[PDB]
Amino acid sequence: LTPEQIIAVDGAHLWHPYSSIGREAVSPVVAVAAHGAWLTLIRDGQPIEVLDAMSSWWTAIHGHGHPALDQALTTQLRVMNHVMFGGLTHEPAARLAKLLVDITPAGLDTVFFSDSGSVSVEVAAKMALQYWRGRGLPGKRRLMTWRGGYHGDTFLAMSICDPHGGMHSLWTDVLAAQVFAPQVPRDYDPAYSAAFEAQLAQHAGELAAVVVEPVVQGAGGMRFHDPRYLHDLRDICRRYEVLLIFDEIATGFGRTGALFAADHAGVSPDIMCVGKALTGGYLSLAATLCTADVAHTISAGAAGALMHGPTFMANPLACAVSVASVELLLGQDWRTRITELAAGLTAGLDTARALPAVTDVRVCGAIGVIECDRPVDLAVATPAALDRGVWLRPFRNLVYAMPPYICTPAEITQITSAMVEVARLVGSL
Amino acid sequence: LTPEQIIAVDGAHLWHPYSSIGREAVSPVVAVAAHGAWLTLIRDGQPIEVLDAMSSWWTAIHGHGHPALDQALTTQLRVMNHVMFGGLTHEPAARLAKLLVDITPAGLDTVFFSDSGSVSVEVAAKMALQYWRGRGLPGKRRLMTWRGGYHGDTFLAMSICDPHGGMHSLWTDVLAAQVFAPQVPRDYDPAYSAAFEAQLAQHAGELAAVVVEPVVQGAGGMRFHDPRYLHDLRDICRRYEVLLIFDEIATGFGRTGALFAADHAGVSPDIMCVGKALTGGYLSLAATLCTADVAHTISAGAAGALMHGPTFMANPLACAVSVASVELLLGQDWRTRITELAAGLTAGLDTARALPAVTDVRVCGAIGVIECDRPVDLAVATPAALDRGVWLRPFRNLVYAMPPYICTPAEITQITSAMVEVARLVGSL
Ligand SMILES: COc1cccc(NC(=O)CCC2CCN(C(=O)c3ccc(C(C)=O)s3)CC2)c1
Numbered sequence: 020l021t022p023e024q025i026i027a028v029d030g031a032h033l034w035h036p037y038s039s040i041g042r043e044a045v046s047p048v049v050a051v052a053a054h055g056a057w058l059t060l061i062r063d064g065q066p067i068e069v070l071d072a073m074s075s076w077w078t079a080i081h082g083h084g085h086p087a088l089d090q091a092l093t094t095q096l097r098v099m100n101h102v103m104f105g106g107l108t109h110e111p112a113a114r115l116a117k118l119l120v121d122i123t124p125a126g127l128d129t130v131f132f133s134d135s136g137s138v139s140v141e142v143a144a145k146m147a148l149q150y151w152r153g154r155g156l157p158g159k160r161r162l163m164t165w166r167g168g169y170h171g172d173t174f175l176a177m178s179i180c181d182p183h184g185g186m187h188s189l190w191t192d193v194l195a196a197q198v199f200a201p202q203v204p205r206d207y208d209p210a211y212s213a214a215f216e217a218q219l220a221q222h223a224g225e226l227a228a229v230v231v232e233p234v235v236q237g238a239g240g241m242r243f244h245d246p247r248y249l250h251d252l253r254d255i256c257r258r259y260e261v262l263l264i265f266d267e268i269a270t271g272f273g274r275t276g277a278l279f280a281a282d283h284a285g286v287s288p289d290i291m292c293v294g295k296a297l298t299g300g301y302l303s304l305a306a307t308l309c310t311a312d313v314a315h316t317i318s319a320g321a322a323g324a325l326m327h328g329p330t331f332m333a334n335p336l337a338c339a340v341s342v343a344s345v346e347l348l349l350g351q352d353w354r355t356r357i358t359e360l361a362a363g364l365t366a367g368l369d370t371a372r373a374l375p376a377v378t379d380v381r382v383c384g385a386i387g388v389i390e391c392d393r394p395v396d397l398a399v400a401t402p403a404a405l406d407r408g409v410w411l412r413p414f415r416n417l418v419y420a421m422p423p424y425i426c427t428p429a430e431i432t433q434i435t436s437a438m439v440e441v442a443r444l445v446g447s448l
Numbered sequence: 449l450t451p452e453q454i455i456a457v458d459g460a461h462l463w464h465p466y467s468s469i470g471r472e473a474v475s476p477v478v479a480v481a482a483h484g485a486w487l488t489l490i491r492d493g494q495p496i497e498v499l500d501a502m503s504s505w506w507t508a509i510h511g512h513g514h515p516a517l518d519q520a521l522t523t524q525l526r527v528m529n530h531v532m533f534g535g536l537t538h539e540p541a542a543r544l545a546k547l548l549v550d551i552t553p554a555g556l557d558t559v560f561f562s563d564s565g566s567v568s569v570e571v572a573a574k575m576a577l578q579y580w581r582g583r584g585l586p587g588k589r590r591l592m593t594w595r596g597g598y599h600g601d602t603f604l605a606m607s608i609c610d611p612h613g614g615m616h617s618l619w620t621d622v623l624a625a626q627v628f629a630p631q632v633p634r635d636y637d638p639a640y641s642a643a644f645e646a647q648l649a650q651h652a653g654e655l656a657a658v659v660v661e662p663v664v665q666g667a668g669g670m671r672f673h674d675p676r677y678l679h680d681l682r683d684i685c686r687r688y689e690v691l692l693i694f695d696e697i698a699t700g701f702g703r704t705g706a707l708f709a710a711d712h713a714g715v716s717p718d719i720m721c722v723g724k725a726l727t728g729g730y731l732s733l734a735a736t737l738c739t740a741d742v743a744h745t746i747s748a749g750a751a752g753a754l755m756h757g758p759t760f761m762a763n764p765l766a767c768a769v770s771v772a773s774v775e776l777l778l779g780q781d782w783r784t785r786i787t788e789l790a791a792g793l794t795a796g797l798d799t800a801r802a803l804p805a806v807t808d809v810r811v812c813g814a815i816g817v818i819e820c821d822r823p824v825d826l827a828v829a830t831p832a833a834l835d836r837g838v839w840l841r842p843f844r845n846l847v848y849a850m851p852p853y854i855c856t857p858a859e860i861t862q863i864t865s866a867m868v869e870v871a872r873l874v875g876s877l
Pocket residue numbers: 103104105106326327328329330331332465466505598600601606609613614615616618667668843
C-alpha cells in the first residue's frame with residue numbers, strides 16, 4: 020500500500036487510541052520507518068525524518084532498531100518463537116525473571132508475566148484480593164488511590180483512574196466505586212499524608228490495597244510529587260495492614276532518574292507493575308512482581324493458585340528482547356545519561372516560563388513538561404512541531420516529551436525548541 | 449543457563465498459568481527449541497523431539513519457525529519495530545485491517561487492535577456499552593451469555609465465564625452480575641432457544657449484549673453445539689434490540705473447519721473478537737471488530753470516541769507477522785487441509801470410545817476430544833504422552849488436541865495414539 024492507500028484504509032477501517040471512526044479532526048500521519056531517535060513520516064506526500072520526542076509513548080528508551088535489540092530478537096527467532104507456559108518453561112523467561120527480581124526494589128521475589136500494562140494491573144489487583152482471601156479477610160476487596168492517576172483501560176484499571184480524567188460521568192453505575200484521596204501535591208506537606216492516613220483508617224477493613232504511580236503521574240496529567248509521600252504510604256500501609264502496589268508501567272527502567280521511581284523514596288511495595296519500556300519498545304509485554312509473603316499466602320489459601328494465565332504468557336520473543344534491553348541499560352552508565360538529558364531538558368525549556376500562556380515548566384529525569392493555561396490545539400501544534408523536525412503529541416493543556424535515552428545534546432535542543440514554539444503559539448490566537 | 453539452572457530460577461521466581469508458587473505437583477518441562485510441529489524438550493537431562501499437539505495453546509496454526517512468518521518478522525524489523533498509534537498510522541496496521549474486514553463475517557467494517565484476547569473482550573464490552581449510551585439508553589449495561597463459557601481473565605471478562613468453572617463463589621461480591629442461560633446443548637433443541645428468548649425478553653431493557661463463543665466452547669470444557677443455535681441468537685438479538693458479540697479468540701482462522709465458526713451458521717455478529725492464532729503463535733495480538741453502525745453511534749455520542757487505547761496498539765511487528773499468517777492460510781486450500789485433519793482425528797480417536805474410563809469422543813475441525821469419567825492426573829498423563837513422542841496437556845476430565853495445520857497424516861495418528869494411551873491409563877489408576 021502507498022501512503023495515500025494507507026490513509027484511505029485507515030479512515031475507513033482503523034480505530035486509534037481514544038478516537039472516532041469518521042469524525043477525526045485531522046488524519047493520522049503515515050509512519051514508514053523508525054531508526055534510532057528518528058521516525059520517518061509522510062508530510063505532503065514526501066518522507067521526512069523527525070525526532071520521536073514521545074519515545075513512541077514511553078516505549079523507545081534505546082531508540083528504534085537498536086542493533087543489540089534487533090539481534091536479540093533475530094537470535095531467539097531462529098531457536099524458538101513461542102511455547103505455551105502451561106507446563107513448560109524456557110531460558111528467556113528464566114533470564115528475565117532473574118534480572119527483574121535482582122533490579123527491582125528489595126523483596127519482590129516472584130514474577131507474573133502478561134501481555135500489557137492494563138492486564139498487569141488487573142493481575143496486581145487479583146493478587147491483592149486473593150491475598151486477603153488467603154488471610155480469611157474477604158471483606159478487604161476495595162482499592163484506594165489518589166487523584167490524577169492512570170492505570171490502564173480495562174474495567175478494573177478504569178476504576179482507579181482519575182474520576183475526572185477517566186470520566187466517571189459516562190461510566191457511572193458500571194465501574195467499581197473505589198476510594199480516592201485528593202490530588203497529591205508537588206511539594207512535600209506532612210498534612211497531606213496525615214489526611215491520607217485518616218481517610219484510609221476509616222476504610223482499612225474493606226481495603227485490599229493502595230495503588231499509585233510513584234513520583235510521576237503520567238497519562239493523568241504529567242504531574243510530579245515528592246518521593247517522601249511514598250515513604251509515608253509504605254508506613255501507613257504497614258500500620259493499617261493494607262497492601263501497597265506501585266504502578267511503574269511508565270516510570271520504570273531509568274525514566275525518572277532512578278532505576279525505578281520507588282528507589283527515589285527507598286521504599287518497596289508489596290506488588291509492582293512494569294510494562295511500557297520493558298522490551299525497549301519492540302513488543303507488548305508486562306510483568307507483575309510480588310513479595311514471597313504475597314505469593315505464599317495466595318498459594319496456601321483455599322484457592323491454591325492465582326487464577327490467571329494469558330495465552331502468550333512469558334512469550335520467548337518478547338522476553339528475549341526484554342533481557343537484551345535491560346542488559347543494555349544496566350551495562351552503561353545510565354544514571355549519568357539520564358542526568359545529562361534532564362539538564363538538557365531544563366536548559367532548553369527554561370525560556371518557556373516567561374511565555375504568557377505558560378503556568379509551569381517541570382522536569383524529572385528524562386521527562387519535560389510545559390503546562391499551559393488553556394487546551395493545546397492539536398491541529399495547530401502537530402504541524403508546528405513537524406516543520407521543526409519533531410514529533411510531539413500534546414494532551415489537554417500540556418506540551419511534553421519523554422525522549423529516547425540515546426538522544427544527543429543537539430537532538431534535545433531540537434526537541435525543546437519545538438516544545439517552546441508550540442507553547443508560544445498557544446498564547447497567540 | 450543450563451536446563452537445571454532454568455528449573456531452579458523457575459521454581460524460585462516464575463508464576464505459571466493458574467499455578468502456585470512453591471506448591472506445584474509437577475515441575476514444568478524445559479523447552480529449548482521449536483520447529484514446525486515439533487518441540488525440543490529436556491527429559492532426564494536429554495533433549496527429545498515431541499509433537500506440539502496443543503499448538504502451544506491454540507496459537508501455532510502454521511507450526512513454529514515457518515519461513516514465511518520468520519521472514520515477515522525480520523523484514524518489518526528492518527524498517528520499523530514500533531511507533532505509537534496515537535496520531536500515526538502504518539502499512540502493517542492498514543494491511544491487516546483490510547484483510548480482517550474482508551474475511552470476517554459480513555458487516556464487520558472497523559478494527560480495534562489490542563495486545564491480548566482478554567483485552568479484546570473488554571474492548572467489545574466497552575463498544576457495546578458506549579453504543580447504548582450513544583443511543584441515550586445507559587440502562588442497557590448488562591451482558592447475557594450461556595453457561596460453559598470462557599472469555600479471559602480480566603475482571604469484566606471473568607464476569608461472563610462459567611460461574612462454576614470460574615469459581616464465582618471465590619469472586620462473590622467483586623464481579624459484575626451477568627445473565628446466564630443454561631448450558632447450550634450439543635444437539636439442536638428448539639425448546640432451548642425458546643427458553644433463551646424468554647429469559648432475554650425479561651432482561652432486554654438492561655442488556656447491552658449477548659456474548660458467546662460460536663460453535664465450540666474452548667477452555668470451559670471443549671463442548672460443541674449445533675450452529676443453528678447461532679442463527680437463533682442472531683434472530684433473538686435483532687428482535688429485542690440487544691447486540692450480539694462473538695468471541696472467536698479460540699475458534700478463528702480455520703480451527704473449527706470454517707474460516708470463522710460464525711460461518712457454520714452464516715451469521716454476522718455486531719462485534720467480534722479474535723486473538724490466539726492471529727499471529728500464527730509468534731506474538732501477542734488481538735482484534736475487536738464492529739459494524740459501521742456501532743462505530744458511528746459511538747463516534748456520534750457525547751464521548752465522541754471509543755475510550756480505549758493500549759500502549760502497543762497495532763504494533764507493526766505483530767501486525768506484519770499476522771498479515772503473513774493470514775495470507776499463508778488464505779493462499780492454500782485450508783478447508784481441505786482441515787477436513788483431512790478432522791478425518792485423521794476421527795479415525796485415530798475411534799478406539800477410545802470402547803475404553804472403560806471414556807464417556808465421549810468428539811471432533812470438530814482440527815479439534816479432537818476424549819472426555820473421561822474422572823479428572824485426568826497430569827502426573828501420569830504428561831510423562832505417558834512424552835514417552836509416546838507427544839506434548840499433551842489435559843485439563844479437568846479432558847484429553848484433547850488442537851494440532852498445527854501442517855501436521856502430516858502420520859503425525860496426526862501419532863498424536864491420537866498418544867491420546868488413546870493416555871485415556872487407557874486414566875482407566876488404570
Ligand atoms: C480468573 O477467574 C477464575 C477464577 C477461578 C477459576 C477459574 N477457572 C477458569 O478460568 C478455568 C478456565 C481455564 C483457562 C485456561 N487454563 C489454563 O490452565 C491455561 C491458561 C493458559 C495456558 C497456557 C497459555 O498454557 S494453560 C485452565 C483454566 C477462573
